[PDB]
Design an enzyme around this catalytic site. Structure first.
Site, PDB file in Angstrom:
ATOM      1  N   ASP A  20       0.839  -1.180   0.000  1.00 41.95           N
ATOM      2  CA  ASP A  20       0.000   0.000   0.000  1.00 41.95           C
ATOM      3  C   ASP A  20       0.887   1.248   0.000  1.00 41.95           C
ATOM      4  O   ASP A  20       2.089   1.186   0.278  1.00 41.95           O
ATOM      5  CB  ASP A  20      -0.925  -0.047   1.212  1.00 41.95           C
ATOM      6  CG  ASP A  20      -1.796   1.173   1.331  1.00 41.95           C
ATOM      7  OD1 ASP A  20      -2.349   1.633   0.311  1.00 41.95           O
ATOM      8  OD2 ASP A  20      -1.916   1.687   2.463  1.00 41.95           O
ATOM      9  N   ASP A  22      -0.204   5.198   0.904  1.00 38.80           N
ATOM     10  CA  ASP A  22      -0.474   6.106   2.015  1.00 38.80           C
ATOM     11  C   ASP A  22      -0.588   5.347   3.332  1.00 38.80           C
ATOM     12  O   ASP A  22      -1.382   4.412   3.458  1.00 38.80           O
ATOM     13  CB  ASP A  22      -1.763   6.887   1.782  1.00 38.80           C
ATOM     14  CG  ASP A  22      -1.668   7.842   0.622  1.00 38.80           C
ATOM     15  OD1 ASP A  22      -0.800   8.731   0.683  1.00 38.80           O
ATOM     16  OD2 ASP A  22      -2.485   7.734  -0.317  1.00 38.80           O
TER      17      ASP A  22
END
Length: 246
Positions: A20, A22
């Protein structure tokens, strides 16, 4: 019940990596445009991918154009918008398409609420809509209810709650499906999946990775079905550095 992750994989093991962005590779910021992946971290990701046949992908709620800007100058396989956008190792892109009348109607519908609520932001992603409220957490319940009404009225749309955001996405789009699409393609196929994430959208990826016999890693606090946990983004950075240089 997630266990603290303290061991780093060997650089040349049989893993396929999914990160991922953020809250995982980049520190959380008051605004998405202030987010940066430090260049040294991008080099570490590029080197890790190079030692694993290129089997490293970014799996994010951001659009793929935003991921390419965050990863510049590196070009990785990507899943944007929770998997509604995807780009494989050969650069082929796969885009989920909504009917134009649905996109037009929902956007006009959402706009009326969010123009009147200071601090909230409507972000249109082409096949998804994100309702941001980091600057006005008091409007969370109103935005959630609006998104729930929209996703109940349009069967093509599904709800995706997240940190300071409520997102409306195509039904059937989720990060577990994105990782699944990669794991049947070279160079990810035949490798053990590893997925690191921090938010509710990442729980879908943790589930398929756990079922796959892979390694699921939650970043930060909160209940999770990930098997392992890292405390913060700098702990991801240190883990990544230890893989490259043990």
């Amino acid at each position: 019940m997630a266990e603290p992750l303290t061991v780093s994989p060997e650089l040349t093991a049989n893993y396929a990596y999914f990160f991922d962005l953020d809250g995982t590779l980049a520190e959380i910021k008051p605004h998405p445009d202030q987010v940066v992946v430090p260049h040294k971290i991008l080099q570490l990701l590029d080197r890790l991918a190079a030692h694993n046949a290129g089997a490293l992908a970014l799996i994010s709620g951001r659009s793929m154009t935003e991921l390419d800007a965050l990863a510049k100058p590196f070009r990785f396989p990507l899943a944007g918008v929770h998997g509604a956008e995807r780009r494989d190792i050969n650069g082929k892109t796969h885009i989920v398409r909504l009917p134009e009348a649905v996109v037009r109607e929902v956007e006009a519908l959402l706009r009326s609420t969010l123009v009147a609520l200071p601090g909230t932001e409507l972000e249109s992603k082409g096949m998804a809509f994100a309702l941001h409220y980091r600057q006005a957490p008091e409007h969370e319940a109103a935005l959630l209810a609006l998104a729930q009404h929209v996703t109940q009225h349009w069967p093509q749309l599904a709800l995706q709650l997240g940190k300071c955001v409520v997102e409306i996405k195509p039904k059937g789009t989720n990060k577990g499906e994105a990782i699944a699409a990669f794991m049947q393609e070279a160079p990810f196929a035949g490798r053990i999946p590893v997925f690191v994430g921090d938010d509710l959208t990442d729980e879908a990826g943790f589930g398929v990775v756990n079922h796959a016999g892979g390694i699921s890693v939650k970043v930060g606090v909160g209940a999770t079905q990930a098997a392992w946990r890292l405390e913060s983004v700098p702990d991801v950075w240190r883990w990544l550095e230890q893989i490259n240089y043990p």
